[PDB]
Amino acid sequence: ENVWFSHPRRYGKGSRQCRVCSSHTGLIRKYGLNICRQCFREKANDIGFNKFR
Amino acid sequence: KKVYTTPKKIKHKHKKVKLAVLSYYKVDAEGKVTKLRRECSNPTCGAGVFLANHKDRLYCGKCHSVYKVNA
Amino acid sequence: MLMPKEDRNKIHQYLFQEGVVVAKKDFNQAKHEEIDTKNLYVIKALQSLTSKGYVKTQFSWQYYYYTLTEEGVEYLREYLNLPEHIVPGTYIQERN
Amino acid sequence: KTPNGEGSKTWETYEMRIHKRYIDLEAPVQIVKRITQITIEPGVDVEVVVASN
Amino acid sequence: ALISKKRKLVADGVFYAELNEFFTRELAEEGYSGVEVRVTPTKTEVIIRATRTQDVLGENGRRINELTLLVQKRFKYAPGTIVLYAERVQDRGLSAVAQAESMKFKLLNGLAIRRAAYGVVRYVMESGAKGCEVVVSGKLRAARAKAMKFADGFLIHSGQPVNDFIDT
RNA sequence: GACGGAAGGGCACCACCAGGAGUGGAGCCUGCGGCUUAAUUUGACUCAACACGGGGAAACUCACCAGGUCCAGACACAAUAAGGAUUGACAGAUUGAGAGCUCUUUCUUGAUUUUGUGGGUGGUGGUGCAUGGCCGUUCUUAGUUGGUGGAGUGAUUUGUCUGCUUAAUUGCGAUAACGAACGAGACCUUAACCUACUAAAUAGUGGUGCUAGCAUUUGCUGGUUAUCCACUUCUUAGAGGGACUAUCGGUUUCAAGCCGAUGGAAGUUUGAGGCAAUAACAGGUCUGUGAUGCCCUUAGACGUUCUGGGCCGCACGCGCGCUACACUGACGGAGCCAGCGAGUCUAACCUUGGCCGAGAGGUCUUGGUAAUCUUGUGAAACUCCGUCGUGCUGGGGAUAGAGCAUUGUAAUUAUUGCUCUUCAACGAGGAAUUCCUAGUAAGCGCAAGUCAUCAGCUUGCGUUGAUUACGUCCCUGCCCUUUGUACACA
Ligand SMILES: [Mg+2]
Ligand SMILES: [Mg+2]
Ligand SMILES: [Mg+2]
Ligand SMILES: [Mg+2]
Ligand SMILES: [Mg+2]
Ligand SMILES: [Mg+2]
Ligand SMILES: [Mg+2]
Ligand SMILES: [Mg+2]
Ligand SMILES: [Mg+2]
Ligand SMILES: [Mg+2]
Ligand SMILES: [Mg+2]
Ligand SMILES: [Mg+2]
Ligand SMILES: [Mg+2]
Ligand SMILES: [Mg+2]
Ligand SMILES: [Mg+2]
Ligand SMILES: [Mg+2]
Ligand SMILES: [Mg+2]
Ligand SMILES: [Mg+2]
Ligand SMILES: [Mg+2]
Ligand SMILES: [Mg+2]
Ligand SMILES: [Mg+2]
Ligand SMILES: [Mg+2]
Ligand SMILES: [Mg+2]
Ligand SMILES: [Mg+2]
Ligand SMILES: [Mg+2]
Ligand SMILES: [Mg+2]
Ligand SMILES: [Mg+2]
Ligand SMILES: [Mg+2]
Ligand SMILES: [Mg+2]
Ligand SMILES: [Mg+2]
Ligand SMILES: [Mg+2]
Ligand SMILES: [Mg+2]
Ligand SMILES: [Mg+2]
Ligand SMILES: [Mg+2]
Ligand SMILES: [Mg+2]
Ligand SMILES: [Mg+2]
Ligand SMILES: [Mg+2]
Ligand SMILES: [Mg+2]
Ligand SMILES: [Mg+2]
Ligand SMILES: [Mg+2]
Ligand SMILES: [Mg+2]
Ligand SMILES: [Mg+2]
Ligand SMILES: [Zn+2]
Ligand SMILES: [Zn+2]
Numbered sequence A: 001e002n003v004w005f006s007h008p009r010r011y012g013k014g015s016r017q018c019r020v021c022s023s024h025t026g027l028i029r030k031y032g033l034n035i036c037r038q039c040f041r042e043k044a045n046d047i048g049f050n051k052f053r
Numbered sequence B: 001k002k003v004y005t006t007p008k009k010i011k012h013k014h015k016k017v018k019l020a021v022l023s024y025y026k027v028d029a030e031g032k033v034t035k036l037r038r039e040c041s042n043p044t045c046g047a048g049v050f051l052a053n054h055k056d057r058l059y060c061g062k063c064h065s066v067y068k069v070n071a
Numbered sequence C: 001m002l003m004p005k006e007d008r009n010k011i012h013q014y015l016f017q018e019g020v021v022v023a024k025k026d027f028n029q030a031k032h033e034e035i036d037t038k039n040l041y042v043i044k045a046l047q048s049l050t051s052k053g054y055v056k057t058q059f060s061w062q063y064y065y066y067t068l069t070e071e072g073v074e075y076l077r078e079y080l081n082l083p084e085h086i087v088p089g090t091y092i093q094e095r096n
Numbered sequence D: 001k002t003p004n005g006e007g008s009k010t011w012e013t014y015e016m017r018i019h020k021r022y023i024d025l026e027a028p029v030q031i032v033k034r035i036t037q038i039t040i041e042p043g044v045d046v047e048v049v050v051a052s053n
Numbered sequence E: 001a002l003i004s005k006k007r008k009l010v011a012d013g014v015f016y017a018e019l020n021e022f023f024t025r026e027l028a029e030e031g032y033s034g035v036e037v038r039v040t041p042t043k044t045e046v047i048i049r050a051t052r053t054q055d056v057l058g059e060n061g062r063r064i065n066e067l068t069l070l071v072q073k074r075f076k077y078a079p080g081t082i083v084l085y086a087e088r089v090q091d092r093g094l095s096a097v098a099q100a101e102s103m104k105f106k107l108l109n110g111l112a113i114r115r116a117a118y119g120v121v122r123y124v125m126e127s128g129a130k131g132c133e134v135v136v137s138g139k140l141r142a143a144r145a146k147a148m149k150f151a152d153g154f155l156i157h158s159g160q161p162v163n164d165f166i167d168t
Numbered sequence F: 001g002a003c004g005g006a007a008g009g010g011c012a013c014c015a016c017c018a019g020g021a022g023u024g025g026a027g028c029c030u031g032c033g034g035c036u037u038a039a040u041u042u043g044a045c046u047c048a049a050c051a052c053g054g055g056g057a058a059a060c061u062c063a064c065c066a067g068g069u070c071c072a073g074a075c076a077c078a079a080u081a082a083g084g085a086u087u088g089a090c091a092g093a094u095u096g097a098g099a100g101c102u103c104u105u106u107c108u109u110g111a112u113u114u115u116g117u118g119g120g121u122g123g124u125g126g127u128g129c130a131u132g133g134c135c136g137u138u139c140u141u142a143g144u145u146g147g148u149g150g151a152g153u154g155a156u157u158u159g160u161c162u163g164c165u166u167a168a169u170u171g172c173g174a175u176a177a178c179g180a181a182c183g184a185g186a187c188c189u190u191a192a193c194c195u196a197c198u199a200a201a202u203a204g205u206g207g208u209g210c211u212a213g214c215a216u217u218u219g220c221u222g223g224u225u226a227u228c229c230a231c232u233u234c235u236u237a238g239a240g241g242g243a244c245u246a247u248c249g250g251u252u253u254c255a256a257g258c259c260g261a262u263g264g265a266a267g268u269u270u271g272a273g274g275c276a277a278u279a280a281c282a283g284g285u286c287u288g289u290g291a292u293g294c295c296c297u298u299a300g301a302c303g304u305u306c307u308g309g310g311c312c313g314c315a316c317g318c319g320c321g322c323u324a325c326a327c328u329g330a331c332g333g334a335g336c337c338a339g340c341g342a343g344u345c346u347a348a349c350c351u352u353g354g355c356c357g358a359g360a361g362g363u364c365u366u367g368g369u370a371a372u373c374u375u376g377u378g379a380a381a382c383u384c385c386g387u388c389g390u391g392c393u394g395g396g397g398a399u400a401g402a403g404c405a406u407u408g409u410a411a412u413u414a415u416u417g418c419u420c421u422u423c424a425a426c427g428a429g430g431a432a433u434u435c436c437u438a439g440u441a442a443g444c445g446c447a448a449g450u451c452a453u454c455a456g457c458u459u460g461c462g463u464u465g466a467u468u469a470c471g472u473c474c475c476u477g478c479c480c481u482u483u484g485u486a487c488a489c490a
Helices: C005-018 C039-050 C072-080 D029-035 E005-025 E063-072 E096-109 E113-124
Strands: C055-058 C065-068 E032-038 E044-050 E082-088 E131-138 E146-153
Touching: C005 C039, C005 C072, C039 C055, C065 E063, E005 E032, E032 E096, E063 E082, E096 E113, E113 E131, E113 E146
Parallel strands: E044 E082
Antiparallel strands: C055 C065, E032 E044, E131 E146
């Protein structure tokens, strides 16, 4: 019962959100992980990304 | 910045006034009851709802928007 | 929250027989897993329950992992009018 | 490397190394039901595919 | 199904990273120390490695029965394809994850910052460790934040054995 | 302790010499200031602000501006209330609007609610001068503290050093200090080497069949996927091997070490990175966070949502970059050479091949969830053969007009691609200033990140590949002692 209140959100930055804190800035679309770049570093050791070089 | 020095713009909400809705009938003695404001042919609400006749148009309040019944 | 009696009775029936109700924090969805009602009708139903006890709430990565407590067993028993000696979820089937 | 925009522009890299093997074994189906329940290991995917047709 | 290995193995790491914080927040009062996952067909095994498993088990299997339901009802597993195993960790005082949770509960009860730090350094160095340090940052009877270094032992800070011999 | 236009020693091309390509000059892209604006959201200001916030903003993102909705104000208490406490709605009016938002109106819905108090919740609201975390920087230079014993009444000092040697508090040694803990080194990752090992139709070659063309005396160059076998030289990477300044000749009193030659894939710490102490900053971020104290706001909302506009406005100043000022070049054919990569499930990603079209592209199908297909990414600079002949020219493609298409609900302030036309400034850039020592500088393009579409950005990679130092402390600046001080906010 809501013709209003909706907008096309199939593309762009507002189409999706980070699965950590719903942030729209600095998000990673690569490899299907959808982690923002500030929270990716705190959980990089948990995923398996390490610093060799 | 946001002190809101705009004009009056008097707006309010709805009312939903509690008038005597079910005081509109035509009851006789011994023993029949003749119901005014005849119903609709809606197959979802079977013989329970009524219709409001305003001006050459009878509207169903149970259904939401568009069901045209005339008399 | 103002919601009809058909939507609320589908929540507490599913809450008692399962114990765990999850709901991702995402609105204008209205169709989600294993519950016919909207995503908004699930979250604000149990958020009304948190301030009187009866349930435990953890946030968990925008997904709202909920946990029924032992005090909410008596409240849903009176609400659904289910008889006693039937407590689903707590008793294990065979060993573990 | 920084969450804000202040500081020297230091970049940070990560890597995850994926190793993959495949072994062809002309085996009867009796030892197939044994080799799947044995040699289990976390983080290891075991795939059994249909023959050449 | 049908996920490439450059994305499925990444999503398995997201699966481990998502369960790291939830089993930290939920099992905070039970001495959480980290988990490991073992995927096998017809039965997926997730080992819950904590310090105190009776509180995780609860009264005759009520809390651990809910923890299996918290996983499979959102992650779209079938009922009966996931079993969470509780396991008591060995040599408590060697893992810094459970000792970091011990710092939080002492400060919420009203214990002093000097006694809560000294109680753990005396516990770790007598548990069989080579060295330990406790760094507390923030305000300590002040309007301005300070920092203290409660170090005791043999600690190196650079190189590859930092990635192997210390937990932070 | 800091600082000296104080001395001694040592080091650095974020320092200079010998040079290289530059920037600053011109147009343009972008960031900042200023001006303007309903708003031109707001942080950051020497190195350590300024192609920064991964910030390539059409909606969204966004916090700004002009307006309209929604409660998603938990719960507790009290009150009103089943004779309805409040929800929904057509048409018309109204509104940007097929928001009942409100109104004309009378059906609907049923205590889930409304009003008030109390209390929560939300906020890209304020405060980074309340903070956590993370990073930057002081230090990319070798520094950094305890145990015990000495010196001093003490603050403190010795150890932690005269000399010599290194990238180094490296060591040889010397000694009221002796033994240790950090950093450096070690370690780890990657690029180089192994005709040896275990192996490969998802990586290649040789041979045997079939078959096409050229010479025909045996050949040569190709094609063909379970025909048929062998091999692992390349390519992939499991376990390993391998330089250790080895050997030798000089040099310092021997010793740590340096220099030269030979051998060797490799003798600058093998090349390049990752990690990186103590103490400190009123460095940056409350606009990464459901990390957070306090304050403000909490419904005609500094919550949230929709429509439209802005972040792109502009006499002007600055910063990072791009294309050029050509004949070592433009232009037209032709030669044709890579690596790091990345790609679609309950969907619409990377695209081969065949047709249509000048192009942009469109259409019909197929391979690949990937060493398999795109892909040998047969990319550019380059190389050949021609035209051009010095004339703001055929160098330069800014500005401006018209049209054809793609992305998207939507492109006007032209998203972007393509075709025609417009064809300006710029004739080697003043004072100043940046980066760099070998497969580096520079030239060149590709991939990835942000991405529905768009880099002229950035992170990686490959191709072509110099000149000139192998030093010094002159300038800027950093370490170690000695000394001076009326500085300690140094
Ligand atoms: Mg919108
Ligand atoms: Mg107000
Ligand atoms: Mg060390
Ligand atoms: Mg090191
Ligand atoms: Mg020179
Ligand atoms: Mg632009
Ligand atoms: Mg600009
Ligand atoms: Mg501006
Ligand atoms: Mg403002
Ligand atoms: Mg601010
Ligand atoms: Mg400053
Ligand atoms: Mg500096
Ligand atoms: Mg840039
Ligand atoms: Mg703002
Ligand atoms: Mg009327
Ligand atoms: Mg600060
Ligand atoms: Mg800080
Ligand atoms: Mg002493
Ligand atoms: Mg000294
Ligand atoms: Mg000393
Ligand atoms: Mg090594
Ligand atoms: Mg080989
Ligand atoms: Mg340091
Ligand atoms: Mg900041
Ligand atoms: Mg931002
Ligand atoms: Mg933050
Ligand atoms: Mg009002
Ligand atoms: Mg008012
Ligand atoms: Mg009012
Ligand atoms: Mg509108
Ligand atoms: Mg706009
Ligand atoms: Mg010419
Ligand atoms: Mg040419
Ligand atoms: Mg060629
Ligand atoms: Mg396909
Ligand atoms: Mg390959
Ligand atoms: Mg080629
Ligand atoms: Mg050529
Ligand atoms: Mg300058
Ligand atoms: Mg490119
Ligand atoms: Mg791109
Ligand atoms: Mg030098
Ligand atoms: Zn996040
Ligand atoms: Zn009806």
